[PDB]
């Protein structure tokens, strides 16, 4: 048994899920990763094939088209998919979170209207929280939703929205009441609604397979029936979405790191310099040992958090933050060391390691930056 | 539920073991730690009290006086005891390993003769492997055991032996055959045997509660009936002992680190500078967050390895090495950060943090130094 | 300022620094993002830089050079790197090529190749690496067989910066036996039959410089183009790298300095939680670390530059230490600066991400940092 | 020339100072370091021999018995002396700082009365700032000095005072006015003064050759004529003194690290395991390269700061803080790595490396903790 075996500890059902996801990634994603990244293509066709396997609504209830899997099942799947394309898998995760928010907090009409098409990916979703003036301080958002009759009139702008322009469903966090978290509500806005526009496609370091652009609302009238949950429940929904988001983005980092470790091990054994394989150099052997050891530690952390969350444990929220902090930091380092191990080749787009580095790098900033993770964790520990 | 709760995930029986060990540590060890360290006292009376609770032969079979507990049970117990005195707990672990080697590889006569007195700690044991010329390269040991009639004549010297002088039973690795790993045998030598002498009591940075002396053999005749296992089985016995040794020393590191995190959290909340608790300083909050996150990661790694070992999994040996490498490195860093958090007070012997630092520091060198751990881990991964 | 890049410099060097920085801010910084996005080799701007004397910074004045010292050169490249690290790094490579010819060539060669390089009428590329010889540079296979007054070259070089655009290629080839002693340095000119280039490589950074394989198929080159004696090639190559490494490290310094300044200003203007980001102690402390490591890296590079110029016996080791320390520390500084910008740091609209992408490769090329440790340890353990 | 040659860049005069200092350390300090540490002995006779060479008042004006050397000359001397005993050299530096404060800010009567005896070390000095409730927040000290006729009546206590009990001259920062820095004054208190007492001799991890005791004042009458500077100038004098003290403590760290690197280099070449010198292992080779590289960087930082301070540049305060921060952190890491390179031997008191580790560790805390250094540095950066 490999010392970095990703299947150890999983039950038979999960090992199957893992195999299916990995096979899909190797066949449909890995061969196209470089192209999607270079051309900044949103892989609609491949994502829809992924949805046919049940990855469009991984942890969404089956009555609305979901696969109804657990947090751990989901982590295992995203980790495997991330070895194919971390950027694309990360977007799939965001899409899933949007569907989960509607599925978990919406009424029956909302669930059967929005979730089915998201699960088949007939339609794609984007999560709209961040604004130019509200990033880490998410609860200070300014986008307003003024209630008038049977509609909410939205005014404001969201920033860095993944999938914007391509998505048909937008889960928007807006302010319906006073200042602070309590005045925020969650409202679904559909592509095509008058008053909804988009900014330019942003050029980024990575996560290129998913379009990034501002989402703008100018006196945008939206049906009150589109509000998910009651007024003032918006930040609660956002905070609960973050627990799973932290586990899942960390799972994407795990996949990139695992792929990087495998590529590195094979490269050291094959590439020769000074008449011997690079693997003959003790310094490189030790670096690889560190990479493998920390990968195993990161995997244990992410899966431990996933189990804690699905079991509804009181330490789950803190564990999700610790796992996200630890895994995104350690996994980026692993990918970056793997790049170093490839030498000049690691800097070329023809080699996957550099994209795992570029894509995993941003995970340290999203779903609550790692600085924010430390604020949350320390607060929790010092309060006890 | 605390984000660093050490009981999470354990079964009911284990939570009880943990409670007993912790209470014993808080009552009998913690109040005396500083004194044992300052006066370099081998705490015979307290260790015997520990044995009364079943800590003298934690994972030794019950038929010979042991407690018959598992690898995970043992890790939990040593982690809890180490919060009281890491040095003393580490020695208890070494003593336990010696008893385990006899229990696991000895014949019935040897098991019932040596194990019972070790389990009650009527007698103490020392493991003798290292020599001046063989440390990391342990299989190159020179101490010879020449068969002569019904006795082996031993000649050579062992170095850094914990408990030497105080121990009545010495598990000695000697060369009965040719060069290399295959010519080593394990033989029990009892205090009082003519030809056995000890070097001076070495002064050290930590682990002061356990005497460190060279063990010298000069034409020391030992009964062939004292050989544990068959001739040439020594290497195997030492290697099997190392798997548990790595888990247990890492467990001692976990205890030191956990104690340090708790002391730090409380200190930050109580000590005031600039008119506010130290905890009000964000840099200190973030450092504590890092400490806690890595403690949880280290704990998962150690317990994961313990479970793999007791389940006899094919990845157990590699995992024990990874766990020892990760935990001893991360835990020392945690204790050292805790020292920094106490300011000048952390440098004073009146504050426990500095001994957790001094004691845990040597764990990165023992049971196979962390450099050796990387050799073993990289070798395994590169051959896959 | 505690990160004042002029401290310790003489009046002349402070003037060089000012000219270099002003040029970078006016001609490079405004175009950095575009050159990177479109992968454009800024010929016109580089020629403007050559007009200021940056085409042959440490080349002798009799052949068009500026005749400046290694320290003067470090100061200049550090300043230019704040505008575009990728482009400045190439200028450094071009300069190294000119220096090898200027320092080891005969008068005819010096006056033939150096003048056009100093005005950048022509550009140069350094060709050492091959598919099978990277860190183990002395194992190169490109052969050069003598035939009359020409050498017939056969082989291929990899990762060549400026390939295709350059007119002068300083090529390390094997004229004799195996190892370092059988290598010679030969100048190959663009347009020579038998010389071709591979595809334009796609990379993470250093996009303003084309990167292509250089292929030789029965390429006939004049024996008169050989710099130095046969078998002196590897010695010339490494001698060139000691200075090249100091200069690549200087480019890292520039990227890091720019990143620290950008971060400082960003923390003071960007507000979250009703206060500037600078009000958060962790960010204040992190900036303190960045500045402290930047000053340490600057001292290391300048210290090595002085040792190299004075030709001290500890110069080779110091250049290696400086390259190792500065490229590692500066990448970390730039990466932290990116974190400090949040999501904005990941956007191509913000310079910090290019300083990260460009400085990252400095830990690999011009002799990887693992190779640096080889050089340093050998020196330490032998004494 | 070695790549870590400590004489490179120094003028002829400084190379001679360095040689004298190193030879003295090798002959009078190195051979006794272990004993002074084990027995906690204040080496009065040896320190007086050092003063005979001009090390009692290295940067004190010559008109009062000083050597009148520059900050850079001083750094070179302390770095060299620290290779013999870091603990003792650190105290010599503190003594020097006290003498400098009197020399630089006192009136001619005080300068000629106190400085001469200090320069020959006929008398020893202690710096008294820290109190139980004021460490990093030094300006919040509580020790009061109430004027009564031509005497000040002192009440309060100081903590962690190096040399307390042995010193004849105590430079005490006390509160003569209102709250904060502006109400602090500097006053010299002589041993034997009624009302002055000392606490127990503190047990510590390192700096054992220095007695550490609390200094207590109970209605202690001290001449107003003993006040250095004007009332309210005390804190300014304290910090001006610390700028130089910080450069010197960092210099002591350089010496500990340099000695550790040399010891490691020789050890790797002589000690053999697996049939070859330890130096044959690439990981150890690379680690030594890192140690040497960081040592050179730290040396440049400290000497750079010394030059800035001597030239009274506007960036001197920030540079001194950066040098102390960088050097104390890097040097402790170097010494700790050196300990690892010695294996178990590095943990024994018979090997010098462990004391360089124990002694250099506290440099990251005292003379202004490294967290405080970051406060000073960030303030400067964000203000400009
Ligand atoms: C962006 C750009 C422009 C680029 O990336 S250009 C390509 C860059 N690639 C490199 O930097 C190559 C990395 N590799 C190297 O520098 C060398 O191959 C190593 C690995 C350090 C040494 O290789 P080895 O095969 O072991 O040769 P080695 O025996 O050390 O040296 C051969 C001779 O050169 C000498 N030498 C080596 N490095 C030297 C240096 N930096 N300065 C001066 N002399 C040097 C060395 O002392 C020896 O002399 P002799 O035996 O005659 O006394
Ligand atoms: C081993 C030994 C001998 C020892 O450990 S001795 C005891 C050592 N303890 C220390 O080093 C104390 C650590 N703390 C300090 O240095 C200071 O208390 C801090 C935390 C940096 C600043 O404290 P604050 O209360 O904020 O005072 P702050 O407003 O910064 O300063 C008061 C005045 O002193 C000045 N000052 C502060 N640090 C200075 C320095 N390093 N150099 C010159 N001036 C300084 C400062 O500019 C201010 O002047 P003004 O406002 O009049 O212009
Ligand atoms: C590729 C990409 C995709 C994205 N996709 C989406 C999406 O689909 N939907 C969406 O809503 N958003 C999305 N975002 C935005 C993301 O949520 C924010 O970028 C992130 O939360 C940080 O906010 P910011 O960029 O404004 O940085 P800031 O909040 O300004 O923070 C900048 C830096 O300061 C630190 N910081 C902030 N506050 C503190 C504090 N109190 N103490 C200490 N340090 C602090 C941060 O950790 C960070 O290092 C995306 C961003 C990127 C780059
Ligand atoms: C407090 C204490 C208690 C101890 N108790 C016992 C006991 O009870 N019984 C017993 O038998 N022993 C005991 N030991 C000894 C311990 O097992 C050895 O000290 C340890 O195994 C290392 O051997 P060494 O000290 O000879 O160091 P060395 O083996 O000489 O190694 C020195 C350094 O080189 C590194 N190194 C070695 N080989 C390589 C390689 N091939 N590649 C890279 N790096 C390498 C090491 O990791 C280390 O950093 C004790 C030691 C201490 C300090
Ligand atoms: C953008 C870019 C521009 C370049 N421009 C030029 C140019 O203009 N001219 C030119 O000649 N070359 C150029 N190069 C090539 C560069 O010199 C090589 O990429 C670099 O020297 C490493 O060689 P390699 O890529 O073959 O990696 P390898 O040599 O295969 O090494 C791979 C990894 O193994 C490590 N390693 C190798 N040997 C050892 C050892 N003995 N012990 C321990 N670790 C070891 C390396 O440090 C590295 O981490 C460029 C490269 C890039 C990415
Ligand atoms: C061996 C030894 C010798 C000494 N000798 C002397 C002497 O001769 N004379 C003398 O006056 N003093 C002496 N000291 C005391 C020394 O100056 C103090 O220990 C040190 O300044 C720290 O104060 P503290 O111990 O009260 O820790 P605290 O000030 O309580 O700080 C504890 C921790 O909090 C951090 N911290 C504090 N404030 C902040 C903040 N605002 N933001 C972030 N982090 C913060 C600190 O850096 C530290 O990590 C000595 C100490 C030792 C250990």
Smallest CA-to-CA distance from C266 within C350, C357, C360 is with: C350
The set of chains that have 3 or more CB pairs under 8 A with A is: B, C, D
Question: Do B311 and B359 sit in the same domain of this protein?
Answer: yes
Q: Work out whether strand C271-272 and strand A169-175 pair parallel, antiparallel, or are unpaired.
A: unpaired
- Nearest-10 Cα torsion for C18, C21, C26, C28: 160
Angle at D359 between CA D356 and CA D362, to 5 degrees: 135
Smallest CA-to-CA distance from A72 within A144, A7, A147, A168 is with: A7
Compute the distance between CA of residue A327 and CA of residue A338 in angstroms, rounded to an integer: 16
Q: At A178, which CATH number?
A: 2.40.110.10
Contacts made by residues A54-58, CB under 8 angstroms, sequence distance 24+: A55/A21, A55/A24, A55/A81, A55/A92, A56/A92, A56/A95, A56/A96, A56/A99, A56/A118, A56/A119, A56/A120, A56/A121, A57/A96, A57/A99, A57/A103, A57/A115, A57/A118, A57/A119, A58/A96
Q: In chain B, which residue's Cα lies nearest the Cα of A324?
A: B293
The gap from C-alpha D273 to its chain's centroid, in whole angstroms, comes to: 39
Burial A143-178 (b: 16+ CB within 10 A, else e): bbbeeeeebbbbbbbbbbbbbbbbbbbbbbbbbbee
Compute the distance between CA of residue D261 and CA of residue C253 in angstroms, rounded to an integer: 27
Let me know: does B89 contact B127? Beta carbons within 8 Å.
no
Q: How far is CA B277 from CA A235, B266, B272, D256, in A?
A: 30, 10, 4, 34
- 3-class DSSP state of B145: strand
Let me know: does C129 contact C157? Beta carbons within 8 Å.
yes
Burial degree of B318 (CB within 10 A; 0-12, 13-18, 19+):
buried
Rounded to a whole number of angstroms, the distance from the CA of A301 to the nearest CA of chain C is 23
The gap from C-alpha A126 to its chain's centroid, in whole angstroms, comes to: 12
Q: DSSP label at B53?
A: T
Take residue B205 and report the two structure tokens written for it.
């940075």
Enzyme catalytic residues of C? 366
The answer to whether C90 is annotated as binding is no
Q: In chain D, which residue's Cα lies nearest the Cα of C263?
A: D382
Compute the distance between CA of residue D376 and CA of residue C141 in angstroms, rounded to an integer: 56
Q: At D37, which CATH number?
A: 1.10.540.10
- 3-class DSSP state of C27: helix
- Using an 8 Å CB-CB cutoff, list chain C residues near B283: 281-282, 285
Let me know: does A157 contact A217? Beta carbons within 8 Å.
yes
Closest-CA residue, ligand 6 atom 25, reads B344
Closest ligand by atom to D364 CA: 6
- Give helix C281-309 / helix B282-310 axis angle, nearest 10°: 90
Question: Do A43 and A104 sit in the same domain of this protein?
Answer: yes
Q: How far is CA B228 from CA A383, B191, C126, C328, in A?
A: 54, 17, 66, 53
Question: What secondary structure does DSSP assign to C51-63, as a single string?
Answer: HTT-SSTTS-GGG
Question: Do B250 and B377 sit in the same domain of this protein?
Answer: yes
The β-bridge partners of A220 are A154
Q: At B376, which CATH number?
A: 1.20.140.10
Question: Do B330 and B251 sit in the same domain of this protein?
Answer: yes
Question: Do C12 and C108 sit in the same domain of this protein?
Answer: yes
Q: DSSP label at C180?
A: G
**End of a domain among B67, B93, B124?**
B124
Let me know: does A256 contact A359? Beta carbons within 8 Å.
yes
- Using an 8 Å CB-CB cutoff, list chain B residues near D203: 38, 348-350
Burial degree of A11 (CB within 10 A; 0-12, 13-18, 19+):
exposed
Q: DSSP label at B221?
A: E
- Containing domain of residue C200, as a range? 124-228
Question: Do B140 and B118 sit in the same domain of this protein?
Answer: no
Question: Do A176 and A31 sit in the same domain of this protein?
Answer: no
Angle at A111 between CA A106 and CA A115, to 5 degrees: 125
Q: How many CB atoms lie within 10 A of CB B44?
A: 11
Q: How many CB atoms lie within 10 A of CB B230?
A: 12
C379 CA to centre of ligand 1 in angstroms: 13
Let me know: does B306 contact A329? Beta carbons within 8 Å.
no
- Give helix C281-309 / helix D370-383 axis angle, nearest 10°: 90
Compute the distance between CA of residue A17 and CA of residue A76 in angstroms, rounded to an integer: 8
Q: Which residue in this structure is represented by tokens 């070329």?
A: A348
Closest-CA residue, ligand 1 atom 28, reads C180
Compute the distance between CA of residue D107 and CA of residue D230 in angstroms, rounded to an integer: 10
Best residue among C364, C366, C372, C375 to mutate for probing ligand 5's pocket (most ligand atoms within 8 Å of CB) is C364
One-letter-per-residue 3-state SS of chain D: CCCCCCCCCCCHHHHHHHHHHHHHHHHHHCCCHHHHHHHCCCCHHHHHHHHHCCCCCCCCCHHHCCCCCCHHHHHHHHHHHHCCCHHHHHHHHHHHHHHHHHHHHCCHHHHHHHHHHHHCCCCCEEEECCECCECCCHHHCCCEEEEECCEEEEEEEEEEEECCCCCCEEEEEEECCCCCHHHEEEEEEECCCCCEEECCCCCECCCCCCCEEEEEEEEEEEEHHHEECCCCCHHHHHHHHHHHHHHHHHHHHHHHHHHHHHHHHHHHHHCEECCEEHHHCHHHHHHHHHHHHHHHHHHHHHHHHHHHHHCCCCCHHHHHHHHHHHHHHHHHHHHHHHHHHCHHHHHECCCCHHHHHHHHHHCCCCCCCHHHHHHHHHHHHHHC
Question: Do D274 and D289 sit in the same domain of this protein?
Answer: yes
Does the CB atom of residue A214 touch ligand 3 within 6 A? no
Does the CB atom of residue A344 touch ligand 5 within 6 A? yes
Smallest CA-to-CA distance from C94 within C75, C119, C69 is with: C119
Q: Which of B266, B296, B312, B324 to mutate to test the interface with A (most CBs of A within 10 A)?
A: B296
**Maximum CA pair distance of chain D?**
79
Question: Do C217 and C243 sit in the same domain of this protein?
Answer: no
- 3-class DSSP state of B228: strand
Take residue C285 and report the two structure tokens written for it.
């402390």
**End of a domain among B200, B229, B258?**
B229
Smallest CA-to-CA distance from B168 within B133, B196, B206, B149 is with: B196
Burial degree of A53 (CB within 10 A; 0-12, 13-18, 19+):
middle
Which residues neighbour C269 within 8 Å (Cβ) at sequence distance 6 or greater? C276
**End of a domain among A171, A197, A229?**
A229
The answer to whether C160 is annotated as binding is yes
Q: Work out whether strand B169-175 and strand B125-128 pair parallel, antiparallel, or are unpaired.
A: parallel
Take residue C90 and report the two structure tokens written for it.
């190439």
Angle at C117 between CA C114 and CA C120, to 5 degrees: 155
Q: Work out whether strand B276-277 and strand B184-190 pair parallel, antiparallel, or are unpaired.
A: unpaired
- 3-class DSSP state of C73: helix
Compute the distance between CA of residue D351 and CA of residue B286 in angstroms, rounded to an integer: 36
Question: Do A70 and A212 sit in the same domain of this protein?
Answer: no
Compute the distance between CA of residue B227 and CA of residue C276 in angstroms, rounded to an integer: 72
C137 CA to centre of ligand 5 in angstroms: 9
How many domains does chain C contain in total?
A: 3
Question: Do C254 and C337 sit in the same domain of this protein?
Answer: yes
Residues closing a segment before a gap in chain D (C–N exceeding 2.5 Å) = none
Question: Do C290 and C361 sit in the same domain of this protein?
Answer: yes
Rounded to a whole number of angstroms, the distance from the CA of C195 to the nearest CA of chain A is 23
Closest-CA residue, ligand 6 atom 4, reads D160
- Using an 8 Å CB-CB cutoff, list chain D residues near C317: 3
Does the CB atom of residue D143 touch ligand 6 within 6 A? no
Burial degree of B115 (CB within 10 A; 0-12, 13-18, 19+):
buried
């Amino acid at each position: 048994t490999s010392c970095i075996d990703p299947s150890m500890g999983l039950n038979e059902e999960q090992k199957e899920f893992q195999k299916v996801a990995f096979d899909f990634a190797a066949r449909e994603m890995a061969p196209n990763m470089a192209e999607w990244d270079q051309k900044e293509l949103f892989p609609v066709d491949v994502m829809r094939k992924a949805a046919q396997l049940g990855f469009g609504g991984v942890y969404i209830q089956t009555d609305v088209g979901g696969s109804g899997l657990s947090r751990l099942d989901t982590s295992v799947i995203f980790e495997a998919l991330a070895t194919g394309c971390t950027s694309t898998t990360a977007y799939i995760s965001i899409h899933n979170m949007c569907a989960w928010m509607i599925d978990s907090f919406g009424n029956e009409e909302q669930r059967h209207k929005f979730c089915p098409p998201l699960c088949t990916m007939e339609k794609f979703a984007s999560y709209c929280l961040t604004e130019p003036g509200s990033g880490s301080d998410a609860a200070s958002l300014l986008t307003s939703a003024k209630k008038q009759g049977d509609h909410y009139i939205l005014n404001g702008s969201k920033a860095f929205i993944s999938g914007a322009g391509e998505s048909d469903i937008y889960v928007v966090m807006c302010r319906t009441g006073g200042p602070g978290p309590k005045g925020i509500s969650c409202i679904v806005v559909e592509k095509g609604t008058p008053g909804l526009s988009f900014g330019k496609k942003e050029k980024k370091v990575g996560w290129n397979s998913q379009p990034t652009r501002a989402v703008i609302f100018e006196d945008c009238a939206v049906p009150v029936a589109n509000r998910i949950g009651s007024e003032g429940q918006g930040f609660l929904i956002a905070v609960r979405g973050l627990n799973g988001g932290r586990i899942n983005i960390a799972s994407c980092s795990l996949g990139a790191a695992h792929a990087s470790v495998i590529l590195t091990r094979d490269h050291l054994n094959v590439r020769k310099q000074f008449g011997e394989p690079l693997a003959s150099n003790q310094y490189l052997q030790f670096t690889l040992a560190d990479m493998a050891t920390r990968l195993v530690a990161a995997r244990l952390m992410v899966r431990n958090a996933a189990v804690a969350l699905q079991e509804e444990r009181k330490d789950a929220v803190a564990l999700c933050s610790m796992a996200k902090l630890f895994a995104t930091d350690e996994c980026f380092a692993i990918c970056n060391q793997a790049l170093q191990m490839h030498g000049g080749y690691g800097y070329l787009k023809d080699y996957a390691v550099q994209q795992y580095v570029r894509d995993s790098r941003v995970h340290q900033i999203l779903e609550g930056s790692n600085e924010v993770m430390r604020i949350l964790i320390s607060r929790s520990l010092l309060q006890e």
